[PDB]
């Protein structure tokens, strides 16, 4: 297979994962805490020690399948791009959204999108474009979290994950 990764941040991690694991083409998706100013961190360093990770989910695509394109149109069906550091309850700086890449030409790629995106909303964007600067993934119990606890706090509507994309 010919697969890329991307990684997104979009509010809590649990909802999220779920989501692009029931898209055909995710190959995977690992929950985990990236961009942040420490190593290795904890649920509860990041949760409370503000070291300023973002909880983002690593997903893995099957290039030939899905673009980069399609992974972004998908992760603005369920985030909210206009709320700053905030997605339902789930408030403060790891929940900010944010796409981070591994590839420096894959950020024009995300600006366009977002540029596109845009321009549906009448407020602006406030999602981060920009490197994987550091990536650490969480703990096991985070793991598939709402396919082990099918009624675990998620607060993003994962049936959107459903609808077709263009063409
Ligand atoms: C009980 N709810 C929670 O713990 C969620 C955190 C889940 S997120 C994947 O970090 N947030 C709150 C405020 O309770």
Known sequence: ???????????????????????????????????????????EDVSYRHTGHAETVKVTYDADKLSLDDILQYFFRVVDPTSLNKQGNDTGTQYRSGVYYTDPAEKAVIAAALKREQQKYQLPLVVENEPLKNFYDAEEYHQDYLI??????????????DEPLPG
């Not at 083409?25 to 420490?38: E, F």
């Not at 082990?148 to 994950?161: Q, V």
């Open 1 to 43: 297979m010919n697969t890329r990764t991307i990684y997104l941040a979009g509010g809590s991690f649990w909802g999220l994962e779920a989501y692009f694991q029931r898209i055909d083409g995710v190959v995977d998706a690992v929950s985990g805490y990236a961009n942040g100013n420490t190593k290795n961190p904890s649920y």
């Open 148 to 161: 082990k606890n099918p009624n675990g706090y998620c607060h993003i509507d994962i049936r959107k994950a």
